[PDB]
Amino acid sequence: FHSFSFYELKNVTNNFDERPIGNKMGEGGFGVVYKGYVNNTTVAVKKLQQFDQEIKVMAKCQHENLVELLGFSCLVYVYMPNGSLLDRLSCLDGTPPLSWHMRCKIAQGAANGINFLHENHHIHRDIKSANILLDEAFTAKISDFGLARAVMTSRIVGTTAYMAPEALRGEITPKSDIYSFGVVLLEIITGLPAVDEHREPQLLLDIKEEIEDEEKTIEDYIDKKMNDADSTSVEAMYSVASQCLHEKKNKRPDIKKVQQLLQEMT
Ligand SMILES: COC(=O)N1CCN([C@H]2CC[C@H](Nc3nc(Nc4cnn(C)c4)nc4ccn(CC#N)c(=O)c34)CC2)CC1
């Protein structure tokens, strides 16, 4: 990794230009992110013990489905031209809806990235669609490893709309990453945010119970902003999401099984 000076990265971001159309993209995991440059190589600058673990994980953990760390001073990464899966599911800033075909590759790519992390005995601890970034080919890239660990804790961290019941109780397990990935799969099927105060149910993970109790079908919840979804592959992704969302952690599939079920889907 390239060691930058805080004054080097100041110029690349036009004196940390906070005005968006400027250089500010938005806030992201304990800091702000700005669009910067290193010749033509467009970069993302993360203006934040806390930032020392990110480099500690990014060092050994190199994979096609993980964001690439370039250097630091601030943390610098290759700028993902298609931003977050969360923003792309909401068509933020006029972007066209993602097709079912694109959603399947993104789901498969995100699962490959989690598999690499679990193979290398790491727990992400904050799997969510805001942390799934998309490159030039809409390849899924897992980001924000600040909370990542390589068990119980007093400092409960994560996004509550995505957290497993045992994670909300203080447990640290890769099985909690599977539950959170289940919430991501529902966001992909439905195009709905994981939590919405203006909704019944308020939490997306609660549609699992609604379908199980036959008050609604998966077909009632399929994102209407696609024209290429087929009931077979949609029900097959929903089946993976449902298995990931088991209240009991040990009943949940491991990432390799999830990866295998998503591969069988296409
Ligand atoms: C209502 O609008 C809002 O306030 N929003 C909109 C903006 N949204 C976020 C803001 C943070 C963005 N983070 C990133 N973006 C981009 N590229 C990019 C964003 N947008 N586009 C078009 C292209 N590349 C990278 C590369 C690496 N890392 C790792 C780190 N550190 C990133 O985080 C990263 C993701 C979208 C939040 C809510």
XYZ file of N, CA and C and ligand atoms in Angstrom:
836
model
N 0.817 -1.211 0.000
C 0.000 0.000 0.000
C 0.853 1.265 0.000
N 0.431 2.270 -0.772
C 1.134 3.544 -0.880
C 0.866 4.435 0.343
N 1.933 4.950 0.973
C 1.792 5.838 2.127
C 1.706 7.292 1.659
N 0.505 7.869 1.752
C 0.239 9.251 1.363
C 0.395 10.165 2.575
N 0.626 11.458 2.326
C 0.687 12.479 3.366
C -0.699 13.110 3.369
N -1.216 13.528 4.541
C -2.550 14.136 4.628
C -2.713 15.334 3.680
N -1.594 16.021 3.402
C -1.528 17.168 2.504
C -1.533 16.753 1.018
N -1.130 15.491 0.703
C -1.146 14.938 -0.664
C -2.603 14.736 -1.097
N -3.385 14.008 -0.263
C -4.800 13.685 -0.473
C -5.738 14.893 -0.355
N -5.245 16.021 0.190
C -6.015 17.259 0.333
C -6.242 17.882 -1.048
N -5.196 17.857 -1.895
C -5.184 18.398 -3.256
C -6.049 17.576 -4.219
N -6.002 16.226 -4.095
C -6.739 15.271 -4.938
C -8.268 15.428 -4.785
N -8.724 15.886 -3.601
C -10.137 16.066 -3.254
C -10.578 17.530 -3.280
N -9.716 18.424 -3.808
C -9.930 19.875 -3.907
C -10.220 20.481 -2.513
N -9.223 20.350 -1.602
C -9.222 20.786 -0.193
C -10.446 20.238 0.571
N -10.679 18.908 0.430
C -11.789 18.127 0.994
C -13.133 18.848 0.795
N -13.423 19.123 -0.488
C -14.607 19.794 -1.021
C -15.862 19.003 -0.619
N -16.568 19.524 0.390
C -17.755 18.917 0.983
C -19.063 19.181 0.220
N -19.031 19.962 -0.866
C -20.260 20.240 -1.611
C -20.582 19.179 -2.694
N -21.716 18.442 -2.599
C -22.050 17.473 -3.662
C -22.816 18.107 -4.837
N -22.671 17.541 -6.058
C -23.349 18.037 -7.269
C -24.706 17.366 -7.488
N -18.814 19.089 -6.754
C -17.722 19.152 -5.797
C -16.963 17.849 -5.685
N -16.783 17.327 -4.446
C -16.043 16.074 -4.263
C -16.703 15.085 -3.278
N -17.613 15.568 -2.400
C -18.309 14.729 -1.419
C -19.361 13.826 -2.064
N -19.259 12.514 -1.790
C -20.186 11.484 -2.271
C -21.284 11.262 -1.226
N -20.862 11.176 0.031
C -21.720 10.971 1.186
C -20.950 10.351 2.329
N -21.641 10.102 3.448
C -21.040 9.495 4.632
C -21.047 7.979 4.506
N -20.027 7.342 5.082
C -19.849 5.896 5.057
C -18.960 5.417 6.180
N -19.513 4.519 7.001
C -18.885 3.866 8.151
C -17.787 4.593 8.910
N -18.180 5.474 9.865
C -17.319 6.273 10.760
C -16.416 7.283 10.019
N -16.942 7.847 8.937
C -16.238 8.844 8.137
C -17.000 9.324 6.920
N -16.393 10.246 6.168
C -16.965 10.797 4.933
C -16.136 10.275 3.752
N -16.765 10.140 2.569
C -16.078 9.646 1.374
C -16.074 10.717 0.280
N -14.891 10.972 -0.308
C -14.736 11.977 -1.363
C -14.086 11.405 -2.614
N -14.535 11.890 -3.775
C -14.039 11.509 -5.089
C -12.721 12.247 -5.295
N -11.658 11.459 -5.493
C -10.286 11.919 -5.697
C -9.603 11.303 -6.905
N -8.350 11.739 -7.204
C -7.571 11.278 -8.370
C -6.078 11.005 -8.093
N -5.513 9.992 -8.769
C -4.088 9.592 -8.722
C -3.708 9.281 -10.204
N -3.706 10.359 -11.041
C -3.482 10.431 -12.495
C -4.843 10.349 -13.175
N -5.217 9.145 -13.616
C -6.509 8.846 -14.227
C -7.300 7.944 -13.269
N -6.579 7.051 -12.530
C -7.094 6.117 -11.518
C -7.965 6.892 -10.523
N -9.303 6.922 -10.758
C -10.251 7.625 -9.880
C -10.290 6.892 -8.551
N -10.266 7.655 -7.450
C -10.191 7.080 -6.107
C -11.276 7.601 -5.155
N -11.498 6.854 -4.079
C -12.439 7.211 -3.023
C -11.614 7.430 -1.761
N -11.726 8.627 -1.164
C -10.958 8.945 0.044
C -11.856 8.959 1.268
N -11.534 8.084 2.227
C -12.265 7.945 3.482
C -11.661 8.814 4.594
N -12.168 10.063 4.731
C -11.754 10.997 5.782
C -12.505 10.599 7.069
N -11.827 9.820 7.942
C -12.374 9.308 9.208
C -12.727 10.429 10.204
N -6.101 2.607 16.170
C -6.879 1.466 16.645
C -8.053 1.163 15.704
N -8.893 2.182 15.409
C -10.067 2.051 14.540
C -9.716 1.874 13.058
N -8.841 2.751 12.507
C -8.423 2.698 11.099
C -7.189 1.797 10.865
N -6.629 1.224 11.950
C -5.478 0.321 11.901
C -5.893 -1.118 11.575
N -7.135 -1.511 11.943
C -7.698 -2.844 11.695
C -8.100 -3.007 10.223
N -8.602 -1.923 9.592
C -9.003 -1.904 8.182
C -7.835 -2.325 7.282
N -6.639 -1.721 7.489
C -5.395 -2.023 6.760
C -4.901 -3.437 7.115
N -5.069 -3.856 8.395
C -4.689 -5.173 8.931
C -5.451 -6.315 8.214
N -6.732 -6.064 7.836
C -7.589 -7.021 7.116
C -7.314 -6.908 5.611
N -7.351 -5.671 5.058
C -7.111 -5.373 3.637
C -5.771 -5.870 3.099
N -4.779 -6.042 4.005
C -3.430 -6.533 3.730
C -3.448 -7.945 3.149
N -3.963 -8.920 3.915
C -4.025 -10.312 3.475
C -5.245 -10.617 2.605
N -6.390 -9.966 2.895
C -7.661 -10.191 2.208
C -7.801 -9.441 0.852
N -7.267 -10.061 -0.222
C -7.351 -9.580 -1.604
C -8.238 -10.572 -2.351
N -9.337 -10.076 -2.928
C -10.284 -10.903 -3.679
C -11.056 -10.023 -4.656
N -11.536 -10.615 -5.760
C -12.284 -9.909 -6.804
C -13.617 -9.340 -6.281
N -14.150 -9.921 -5.203
C -15.397 -9.450 -4.605
C -15.214 -8.671 -3.288
N -14.041 -8.064 -3.100
C -13.764 -7.193 -1.952
C -13.211 -5.916 -2.534
N -13.605 -4.748 -1.995
C -13.054 -3.479 -2.491
C -11.531 -3.481 -2.340
N -10.817 -2.857 -3.281
C -9.365 -2.841 -3.214
C -8.842 -1.610 -2.478
N -8.002 -1.827 -1.454
C -7.361 -0.716 -0.741
C -6.079 -0.368 -1.499
N -5.918 0.917 -1.868
C -4.728 1.397 -2.583
C -3.646 1.883 -1.622
N -4.032 2.815 -0.755
C -3.178 3.414 0.259
C -3.948 4.084 1.379
N -3.269 4.991 2.103
C -3.794 5.691 3.280
C -2.922 6.902 3.650
N -3.319 7.655 4.704
C -2.550 8.782 5.238
C -2.450 8.720 6.764
N -7.022 9.147 6.692
C -7.659 8.908 5.405
C -7.326 7.520 4.862
N -8.287 6.886 4.163
C -8.079 5.586 3.506
C -8.401 5.744 2.019
N -7.528 5.256 1.116
C -7.795 5.449 -0.314
C -8.022 4.094 -1.028
N -9.092 4.076 -1.847
C -9.592 2.909 -2.581
C -9.858 3.271 -4.026
N -9.958 2.243 -4.910
C -10.379 2.465 -6.300
C -11.844 2.975 -6.213
N -12.175 4.057 -6.909
C -13.538 4.591 -6.880
C -14.449 3.622 -7.649
N -15.495 3.077 -6.977
C -16.478 2.157 -7.573
C -17.390 2.992 -8.446
N -17.374 2.873 -9.780
C -18.196 3.790 -10.560
C -19.697 3.626 -10.374
N -20.161 2.445 -9.905
C -21.608 2.336 -9.779
C -22.123 2.388 -8.328
N -21.268 2.856 -7.414
C -21.597 3.064 -6.008
C -22.172 1.888 -5.261
N -23.102 2.140 -4.324
C -23.644 1.052 -3.509
C -24.860 0.355 -4.111
N -25.014 -0.900 -3.759
C -26.195 -1.697 -4.116
C -27.446 -1.026 -3.524
N -27.340 -0.479 -2.284
C -28.473 0.229 -1.669
C -28.969 1.350 -2.571
N -28.056 2.213 -3.042
C -28.426 3.336 -3.924
C -28.941 2.869 -5.271
N -28.346 1.813 -5.816
C -28.790 1.264 -7.100
C -30.151 0.572 -6.982
N -30.467 -0.039 -5.809
C -31.816 -0.592 -5.607
C -32.856 0.530 -5.491
N -32.478 1.714 -4.998
C -33.458 2.793 -4.886
C -33.472 3.727 -6.089
N -32.642 3.431 -7.122
C -32.490 4.228 -8.358
C -32.071 5.627 -8.018
N -31.244 5.764 -6.971
C -30.785 7.074 -6.527
C -30.087 7.828 -7.656
N -30.462 9.101 -7.773
C -29.952 10.074 -8.736
C -30.275 9.741 -10.196
N -31.397 9.059 -10.417
C -31.877 8.764 -11.763
C -31.314 7.562 -12.465
N -30.526 6.737 -11.773
C -29.957 5.538 -12.380
C -31.083 4.519 -12.725
N -30.987 3.789 -13.849
C -32.058 2.830 -14.178
C -32.122 1.641 -13.203
N -33.319 1.076 -12.976
C -33.403 -0.102 -12.090
C -32.474 -1.228 -12.532
N -31.965 -2.029 -11.583
C -31.147 -3.169 -11.908
C -32.037 -4.301 -12.427
N -31.615 -4.993 -13.479
C -32.380 -6.121 -13.978
C -32.192 -7.332 -13.058
N -33.112 -8.306 -13.149
C -33.038 -9.556 -12.405
C -31.737 -10.262 -12.711
N -31.332 -10.305 -13.993
C -30.071 -10.886 -14.429
C -28.900 -10.240 -13.704
N -28.890 -8.901 -13.603
C -27.819 -8.194 -12.887
C -27.893 -8.520 -11.378
N -29.107 -8.529 -10.808
C -29.291 -8.853 -9.376
C -28.735 -10.215 -8.967
N -28.891 -11.251 -9.834
C -28.367 -12.593 -9.617
C -26.849 -12.645 -9.560
N -26.173 -11.936 -10.474
C -24.702 -11.866 -10.505
C -24.186 -11.135 -9.248
N -24.864 -10.071 -8.845
C -24.529 -9.278 -7.651
C -24.656 -10.166 -6.388
N -25.782 -10.904 -6.260
C -25.990 -11.829 -5.161
C -24.901 -12.899 -5.108
N -24.518 -13.462 -6.272
C -23.481 -14.493 -6.379
C -22.116 -13.952 -6.032
N -21.825 -12.756 -6.510
C -20.581 -12.040 -6.245
C -20.438 -11.681 -4.783
N -21.504 -11.137 -4.162
C -21.471 -10.799 -2.733
C -21.202 -12.032 -1.875
N -21.802 -13.191 -2.230
C -21.623 -14.461 -1.507
C -20.211 -15.025 -1.636
N -19.570 -14.802 -2.808
C -18.193 -15.212 -3.085
C -17.233 -14.414 -2.201
N -17.505 -13.116 -2.043
C -16.723 -12.226 -1.188
C -16.804 -12.616 0.282
N -18.023 -12.929 0.787
C -18.225 -13.379 2.176
C -17.506 -14.721 2.405
N -17.576 -15.637 1.409
C -16.898 -16.937 1.463
C -15.404 -16.780 1.632
N -14.805 -15.814 0.918
C -13.370 -15.564 1.006
C -13.001 -15.110 2.417
N -13.826 -14.232 3.005
C -13.614 -13.704 4.350
C -13.709 -14.800 5.415
N -14.727 -15.689 5.309
C -14.970 -16.789 6.240
C -13.917 -17.885 6.109
N -13.402 -18.117 4.874
C -12.321 -19.078 4.567
C -11.035 -18.624 5.272
N -10.829 -17.296 5.346
C -9.668 -16.668 5.964
C -9.913 -16.284 7.440
N -10.896 -16.961 8.066
C -11.321 -16.854 9.460
C -11.581 -15.415 9.895
N -12.328 -14.662 9.077
C -12.737 -13.297 9.392
C -14.248 -13.219 9.393
N -14.807 -12.382 10.272
C -16.239 -12.098 10.402
C -16.367 -10.641 9.988
N -17.277 -10.319 9.045
C -17.446 -8.939 8.579
C -18.043 -8.041 9.650
N -19.140 -8.508 10.278
C -19.923 -7.871 11.338
C -20.822 -6.721 10.849
N -20.789 -6.347 9.551
C -21.693 -5.283 9.077
C -22.113 -5.465 7.593
N -22.564 -6.680 7.250
C -23.079 -7.029 5.943
C -24.430 -6.312 5.794
N -24.501 -5.432 4.790
C -25.678 -4.653 4.428
C -25.518 -4.183 2.984
N -26.617 -3.738 2.328
C -26.532 -3.324 0.928
C -25.744 -2.031 0.724
N -25.638 -1.172 1.761
C -24.838 0.064 1.699
C -23.348 -0.275 1.623
N -22.976 -1.480 2.099
C -21.606 -2.008 2.099
C -21.319 -2.942 0.958
N -22.228 -2.990 -0.040
C -21.968 -3.790 -1.228
C -21.798 -2.786 -2.324
N -20.581 -2.647 -2.810
C -20.306 -1.686 -3.872
C -20.211 -2.349 -5.234
N -20.432 -1.563 -6.282
C -20.505 -2.019 -7.666
C -19.508 -1.321 -8.591
N -18.636 -2.114 -9.210
C -17.635 -1.603 -10.136
C -18.248 -1.299 -11.535
N -17.369 -1.106 -12.562
C -17.747 -0.739 -13.929
C -18.596 -1.810 -14.635
N -18.421 -3.083 -14.254
C -19.197 -4.196 -14.806
C -20.333 -4.638 -13.852
N -20.671 -3.816 -12.835
C -21.634 -4.112 -11.758
C -21.231 -5.384 -10.983
N -19.921 -5.638 -10.853
C -19.394 -6.754 -10.050
C -19.530 -6.313 -8.573
N -20.094 -7.166 -7.731
C -20.288 -6.902 -6.306
C -18.960 -6.905 -5.572
N -18.730 -5.858 -4.780
C -17.521 -5.749 -3.973
C -17.858 -5.394 -2.527
N -17.536 -6.288 -1.596
C -17.763 -6.071 -0.153
C -16.789 -4.982 0.354
N -17.340 -3.938 1.033
C -16.593 -2.841 1.666
C -16.800 -2.750 3.199
N -16.148 -1.729 3.817
C -16.205 -1.302 5.214
C -15.888 -2.397 6.232
N -14.587 -2.717 6.387
C -14.068 -3.754 7.295
C -13.547 -3.210 8.654
N -13.999 -2.015 9.038
C -13.608 -1.358 10.283
C -14.022 -2.081 11.556
N -15.188 -2.787 11.520
C -15.765 -3.546 12.645
C -15.347 -5.008 12.627
N -14.800 -5.482 11.480
C -14.371 -6.863 11.254
C -13.437 -7.418 12.323
N -13.637 -8.704 12.668
C -12.854 -9.439 13.662
C -12.387 -10.759 13.044
N -11.264 -11.323 13.552
C -10.666 -12.578 13.093
C -10.873 -13.722 14.090
N -17.797 -16.600 21.232
C -17.168 -15.305 21.543
C -18.250 -14.232 21.843
N -18.026 -13.391 22.886
C -18.957 -12.327 23.271
C -18.281 -10.978 23.485
N -19.053 -9.888 23.303
C -18.608 -8.502 23.462
C -19.601 -7.651 24.271
N -19.085 -6.586 24.916
C -19.888 -5.628 25.679
C -20.339 -4.483 24.761
N -19.523 -4.177 23.720
C -19.785 -3.135 22.723
C -20.506 -3.750 21.512
N -21.856 -3.749 21.544
C -22.674 -4.300 20.458
C -22.699 -3.311 19.282
N -22.156 -3.754 18.136
C -22.029 -2.962 16.906
C -22.627 -3.671 15.677
N -23.136 -2.864 14.753
C -23.745 -3.303 13.504
C -24.971 -2.483 13.179
N -25.655 -2.830 12.085
C -26.881 -2.131 11.677
C -28.026 -3.012 12.131
N -28.884 -2.491 13.030
C -29.942 -3.259 13.710
C -30.965 -3.895 12.769
N -31.389 -3.213 11.675
C -32.321 -3.771 10.675
C -31.778 -5.051 9.963
N -30.453 -5.282 10.036
C -29.755 -6.415 9.420
C -29.207 -7.425 10.425
N -29.178 -7.092 11.718
C -28.557 -7.945 12.736
C -29.325 -9.165 13.148
N -28.569 -10.253 13.324
C -29.056 -11.538 13.787
C -29.499 -11.410 15.273
N -30.497 -12.189 15.773
C -30.879 -12.061 17.201
C -29.711 -12.292 18.163
N -28.821 -13.253 17.865
C -27.664 -13.514 18.725
C -26.620 -12.389 18.682
N -26.530 -11.639 17.553
C -25.610 -10.507 17.428
C -26.120 -9.340 18.256
N -27.447 -9.179 18.338
C -28.055 -8.124 19.141
C -27.890 -8.458 20.651
N -27.553 -9.717 20.977
C -27.301 -10.191 22.338
C -25.814 -10.195 22.718
N -24.941 -9.786 21.807
C -23.508 -9.673 22.077
C -22.607 -10.726 21.482
N -23.172 -11.805 20.918
C -22.389 -12.877 20.288
C -21.662 -12.403 19.003
N -20.457 -12.961 18.741
C -19.613 -12.702 17.560
C -19.383 -14.044 16.875
N -20.059 -14.248 15.742
C -20.045 -15.503 14.988
C -20.187 -15.251 13.468
N -19.521 -16.040 12.585
C -19.726 -15.845 11.141
C -21.190 -16.097 10.735
N -21.939 -16.868 11.559
C -23.353 -17.200 11.348
C -24.244 -15.966 11.336
N -23.804 -14.882 11.983
C -24.510 -13.611 12.035
C -24.371 -12.887 10.683
N -23.239 -13.113 9.975
C -22.972 -12.555 8.637
C -23.969 -13.177 7.628
N -24.294 -14.484 7.793
C -25.254 -15.228 6.969
C -26.671 -14.630 7.116
N -27.099 -14.379 8.370
C -28.389 -13.766 8.652
C -28.506 -12.412 7.940
N -27.477 -11.532 8.080
C -27.409 -10.206 7.455
C -27.438 -10.294 5.917
N -26.804 -11.319 5.355
C -26.822 -11.564 3.908
C -28.242 -11.946 3.440
N -29.001 -12.615 4.312
C -30.401 -12.931 4.061
C -31.250 -11.693 3.900
N -30.988 -10.668 4.687
C -31.699 -9.386 4.611
C -31.367 -8.702 3.247
N -30.089 -8.774 2.836
C -29.578 -8.265 1.551
C -30.282 -8.964 0.376
N -30.464 -10.283 0.469
C -31.170 -11.024 -0.559
C -32.607 -10.583 -0.725
N -33.289 -10.246 0.382
C -34.659 -9.733 0.349
C -34.696 -8.345 -0.269
N -33.701 -7.518 0.005
C -33.585 -6.179 -0.593
C -33.423 -6.310 -2.110
N -32.630 -7.279 -2.552
C -32.432 -7.569 -3.975
C -33.741 -8.031 -4.676
N -34.516 -8.942 -4.042
C -35.778 -9.460 -4.601
C -36.833 -8.382 -4.698
N -36.984 -7.635 -3.628
C -38.049 -6.662 -3.435
C -37.742 -5.230 -3.808
N -36.457 -4.871 -3.788
C -36.007 -3.499 -3.994
C -36.437 -2.583 -2.857
N -36.817 -3.173 -1.701
C -37.275 -2.422 -0.523
C -36.146 -2.193 0.474
N -36.137 -1.041 1.161
C -35.119 -0.820 2.210
C -35.357 -1.744 3.422
N -34.271 -2.226 4.096
C -34.345 -3.143 5.256
C -35.220 -2.648 6.395
N -35.372 -1.319 6.543
C -36.241 -0.716 7.543
C -36.953 0.487 6.942
N -38.242 0.597 7.231
C -39.065 1.710 6.793
C -40.142 1.929 7.832
N -40.116 3.109 8.492
C -41.113 3.519 9.496
C -42.514 3.606 8.857
N -42.562 3.990 7.566
C -43.787 4.105 6.785
C -44.028 2.762 6.074
N -44.259 1.666 6.839
C -44.465 0.355 6.227
C -45.021 -0.682 7.191
N -45.697 -1.694 6.639
C -46.195 -2.839 7.381
C -45.756 -4.108 6.621
N -44.747 -4.878 7.123
C -43.987 -4.671 8.371
C -42.910 -3.600 8.223
N -42.514 -2.951 9.335
C -41.480 -1.918 9.320
C -40.122 -2.485 8.936
N -39.837 -3.717 9.393
C -38.601 -4.424 9.098
C -38.851 -5.416 7.992
N -37.993 -5.374 6.948
C -38.090 -6.245 5.793
C -37.997 -7.728 6.144
N -37.133 -8.087 7.111
C -36.928 -9.481 7.538
C -38.252 -10.117 8.029
N -39.244 -9.285 8.408
C -40.536 -9.758 8.875
C -41.488 -10.190 7.738
N -41.098 -10.013 6.432
C -41.912 -10.507 5.307
C -41.820 -12.033 5.251
N -40.738 -12.598 5.805
C -40.516 -14.037 5.896
C -41.702 -14.676 6.653
N -42.093 -14.073 7.795
C -43.202 -14.565 8.601
C -44.535 -14.417 7.887
N -44.760 -13.264 7.214
C -45.953 -12.945 6.406
C -46.228 -13.955 5.310
N -45.152 -14.455 4.639
C -45.183 -15.463 3.569
C -45.424 -16.860 4.178
N -44.692 -17.190 5.261
C -44.806 -18.440 6.024
C -46.244 -18.666 6.566
N -46.908 -17.573 7.044
C -48.275 -17.572 7.580
C -49.331 -17.369 6.491
N -48.885 -17.304 5.220
C -49.687 -17.173 3.989
C -50.604 -15.926 3.958
N -50.160 -14.821 4.591
C -50.875 -13.530 4.570
C -50.523 -12.769 3.257
N -49.416 -13.184 2.602
C -48.877 -12.627 1.357
C -47.972 -13.666 0.703
N -47.660 -13.505 -0.604
C -46.762 -14.421 -1.343
C -45.463 -13.694 -1.690
N -44.444 -14.431 -2.151
C -43.174 -13.824 -2.555
C -43.424 -12.976 -3.821
N -44.358 -13.433 -4.683
C -44.802 -12.765 -5.902
C -45.396 -11.396 -5.613
N -46.057 -11.230 -4.443
C -46.611 -9.934 -4.030
C -45.469 -8.946 -3.714
N -44.285 -9.471 -3.352
C -43.162 -8.644 -2.905
C -42.049 -8.418 -3.934
N -42.064 -9.137 -5.081
C -41.078 -9.009 -6.177
C -41.008 -7.566 -6.646
N -39.787 -7.017 -6.775
C -39.595 -5.632 -7.208
C -40.324 -5.441 -8.536
N -41.231 -4.477 -8.604
C -41.983 -4.205 -9.828
C -41.150 -3.426 -10.865
N -39.942 -2.996 -10.489
C -39.032 -2.242 -11.351
C -38.109 -3.141 -12.193
N -38.496 -4.391 -12.432
C -37.800 -5.356 -13.299
C -38.821 -5.875 -14.286
N -38.401 -6.384 -15.434
C -39.308 -7.009 -16.425
C -38.841 -8.423 -16.747
N -37.703 -8.824 -16.202
C -37.056 -10.104 -16.528
C -36.955 -11.097 -15.374
N -37.750 -10.930 -14.334
C -37.693 -11.923 -13.248
C -38.603 -13.090 -13.648
N -38.206 -14.300 -13.324
C -38.994 -15.511 -13.547
C -39.253 -16.068 -12.150
N -40.454 -16.598 -11.908
C -40.836 -17.121 -10.597
C -39.891 -18.193 -10.047
N -39.319 -19.027 -10.914
C -38.431 -20.130 -10.530
C -37.163 -19.640 -9.828
N -36.413 -18.718 -10.461
C -35.160 -18.236 -9.874
C -35.417 -17.306 -8.701
N -36.531 -16.560 -8.735
C -36.950 -15.655 -7.667
C -37.287 -16.438 -6.390
N -38.049 -17.539 -6.540
C -38.414 -18.406 -5.446
C -37.161 -19.125 -4.922
N -36.212 -19.436 -5.806
C -34.942 -20.085 -5.455
C -34.059 -19.110 -4.654
N -34.040 -17.793 -4.995
C -33.270 -16.822 -4.199
C -33.987 -16.591 -2.853
N -35.333 -16.511 -2.876
C -36.123 -16.360 -1.653
C -35.879 -17.519 -0.692
N -35.723 -18.742 -1.223
C -35.474 -19.935 -0.429
C -34.124 -19.818 0.285
N -33.096 -19.278 -0.395
C -31.792 -19.027 0.217
C -31.940 -17.948 1.294
N -32.665 -16.845 1.005
C -32.865 -15.766 1.968
C -33.537 -16.307 3.259
N -34.631 -17.086 3.108
C -35.407 -17.722 4.168
C -34.520 -18.634 5.047
N -33.660 -19.475 4.438
C -32.716 -20.354 5.152
C -31.675 -19.534 5.974
N -31.192 -18.396 5.409
C -30.244 -17.493 6.040
C -30.875 -16.815 7.254
N -32.181 -16.527 7.185
C -32.919 -15.799 8.209
C -33.501 -16.665 9.367
N -33.033 -17.917 9.518
C -33.448 -18.811 10.607
C -33.055 -18.158 11.938
N -34.007 -18.067 12.883
C -33.800 -17.461 14.202
C -32.692 -18.146 14.978
N -32.556 -19.467 14.807
C -31.517 -20.268 15.438
C -30.307 -20.337 14.510
N -29.181 -19.763 14.966
C -27.917 -19.645 14.241
C -27.356 -20.945 13.677
N -27.458 -22.056 14.412
C -26.877 -23.332 13.989
C -27.685 -24.023 12.890
N -28.959 -23.632 12.734
C -29.853 -24.162 11.703
C -29.569 -23.499 10.328
N -28.913 -22.314 10.333
C -28.556 -21.533 9.139
C -27.493 -22.225 8.296
N -27.547 -22.105 6.952
C -26.469 -22.691 6.138
C -25.153 -21.932 6.298
N -24.032 -22.586 6.008
C -22.752 -21.895 6.043
C -22.597 -21.165 4.687
N -21.607 -20.262 4.554
C -21.431 -19.483 3.322
C -21.201 -20.375 2.083
N -20.484 -21.507 2.218
C -20.260 -22.433 1.108
C -21.561 -23.012 0.561
N -22.525 -23.351 1.449
C -23.830 -23.868 1.045
C -24.630 -22.768 0.339
N -24.596 -21.534 0.885
C -25.274 -20.347 0.346
C -24.765 -20.108 -1.078
N -23.425 -20.111 -1.241
C -22.693 -19.941 -2.497
C -23.130 -21.005 -3.524
N -23.289 -22.269 -3.065
C -23.713 -23.426 -3.863
C -25.184 -23.300 -4.316
N -26.073 -22.833 -3.423
C -27.501 -22.656 -3.726
C -27.746 -21.502 -4.711
N -26.932 -20.440 -4.623
C -26.998 -19.282 -5.530
C -26.458 -19.654 -6.926
N -25.468 -20.560 -6.992
C -24.894 -21.074 -8.242
C -25.909 -21.964 -8.960
N -26.631 -22.836 -8.203
C -27.671 -23.736 -8.722
C -28.854 -22.948 -9.312
N -29.094 -21.741 -8.780
C -30.167 -20.828 -9.162
C -30.092 -20.393 -10.647
N -28.862 -20.166 -11.165
C -28.653 -19.721 -12.546
C -28.410 -20.893 -13.498
C -29.106 10.632 -0.658
O -27.790 10.575 -1.198
C -26.869 10.216 -0.260
O -26.543 10.958 0.660
N -26.313 8.979 -0.525
C -25.577 8.788 -1.757
C -24.188 8.246 -1.501
N -24.274 7.025 -0.697
C -22.961 6.362 -0.534
C -21.787 7.285 -0.174
C -20.511 6.489 0.041
C -20.163 5.722 -1.239
N -18.898 5.018 -1.016
C -18.118 4.728 -2.155
N -18.492 5.179 -3.352
C -17.778 4.887 -4.434
N -18.248 5.361 -5.661
C -19.453 5.922 -5.931
C -20.458 6.424 -5.076
N -21.507 6.925 -5.756
N -21.152 6.726 -7.035
C -22.040 7.097 -8.124
C -19.937 6.122 -7.197
N -16.654 4.159 -4.421
C -16.264 3.722 -3.219
C -15.065 2.900 -3.197
C -14.638 2.434 -2.019
N -15.291 2.700 -0.846
C -14.748 2.088 0.345
C -14.573 3.068 1.426
N -14.445 3.871 2.255
C -16.462 3.444 -0.770
O -17.090 3.649 0.261
C -16.953 3.992 -2.055
C -21.296 4.744 -1.568
C -22.616 5.481 -1.741
C -24.889 7.286 0.616
C -26.261 7.953 0.501
